Structure 1
């Protein structure tokens, strides 16, 4: 088993912390949802290859431009997150997060991940966003942003129901293993 490093980036409301918690426990917390994530080393077997994938969160580092890049050394794969219920989190991807990740992690694959996909057809979400002349992020807008930023791929998931969560981390492992 080779050791690989994954770091998740994105706005504070993108759901990166919850995604790491649900994947690491293979469960959406039934009693208490933790505020923070420390680290984890997941044992993953993808396409017959065994990998120990270390997982890191950047939550709490968004306002600290000299502390935040300390999370990047030797990263093998980046998960760049946005929330499907927040078109503002998608707008911050191309010229805030993308230039930063390309600078500190040159040539590292980026997977653009649309989190909270369960809220795309949520009536409360659609009513709230319509007050700001907005709507939940469409799959094609996600794919186009991923294409634009030179992402390795585009994926969607829901930490709430677990749908798509395993597939995201299995694909991140595949990306980390590429030349």
Structure 2
């Protein structure tokens, strides 16, 4: 499919990675989505009047390693690190996923978007929005609070990540010209 952008959904179990993915690609909030299913999904979109083919890996399962995860961790061009605003532990695990990316890629410069999901569960919030914003400033990455239940800011997440990949790519082309 022309030039695909491989994207990887990272996050603890139960933060809503599958819900956000299904909402992005099909506008459907899943009913009883099996939390053990890991799979990749294709979708074509337009950011800034330019189309892009996306290939998004929705990570899951209790196995330590899979052929799919191994390939996408190495070849992925962008990462969506997700936590739930109702689960502070999943918010701390975000830092562990950032470490995992460096251990695989041996770099910190891979495009990343940080997302706090389940924003609609306002009364169960365990992590403030300012804490996410501050952590994203630590990572030098965009931040969003989303609701996969009602599709709040789901498009903005994947658009921002593709924007980052494009900007980083155009920088390498300009550096190669000099």
Same fold (TM over 0.5): yes
What does residue 171 of structure 2 align with? Answer: none
**Deviation of residue 90 (structure 1)?**
0.7
1:167 aligns to 2:156 (yes or no): yes
The structure carrying a bigger helix percent of its residues is 2
Corresponding residue to 2:142 among 153, 163, 169: 153
Cα contact 1:146–1:153 (8 A) shared by 2: yes
When residues 151 and 59 of structure 1 are mapped into structure 2, their CA distance, relative to the original with a 3 A threshold, is farther
Deviation per residue, 1:12-64 (Å, 9 max, x gap):
122111111111112224xx343235221111110122100101012115x51
**CA distance in 2 between partners of 1:2 and 1:143 (Å):** 32
Unmatched tracts of structure 2, length 5 or more: 169-178
Matched, 1:116 2:106: no
Higher relative contact order (CA 8 A, sep 6+): 1
How does 1:76-155 map onto structure 2 within 5 Å?
A: 76-94=77-95, 96-105=96-105, 106=107, 107-119=109-121, 121-122=122-123, 125=124, 136-148=126-138, 150-155=139-144
**Superposed CA RMSD:** 2.0
Q: Does the CA-based 8 Å contact 1:111-1:151 persist in structure 2? A: no
* 1:176 and 2:165 correspond: yes
**What are structure 1's unaligned runs of at least 5 residues?**
126-134
Query: Alpha-carbon deviation of 1:6?
Result: 0.4
* C-alpha distance in structure 2 between counterparts of 1:65 and 1:40, whole Å: 19
In the superposition, the TM-score normalised over structure 1's length comes to 0.81
Q: TM-score, normalised by structure 2?
A: 0.82
Equivalent-residue separation in structure 2 for 1:154 and 1:25 (angstroms) = 23
| Residue 3 of structure 1: how far off its partner (Å) | 1.5
Q: Bigger CA drift: 63-72 or 110-119?
A: 63-72
1:128 is matched with: none
- Runs (4+) of structure 1 exceeding 2 A deviation are 65-71
Q: Distance in 1 between matches of 2:70 and 2:39?
A: 17
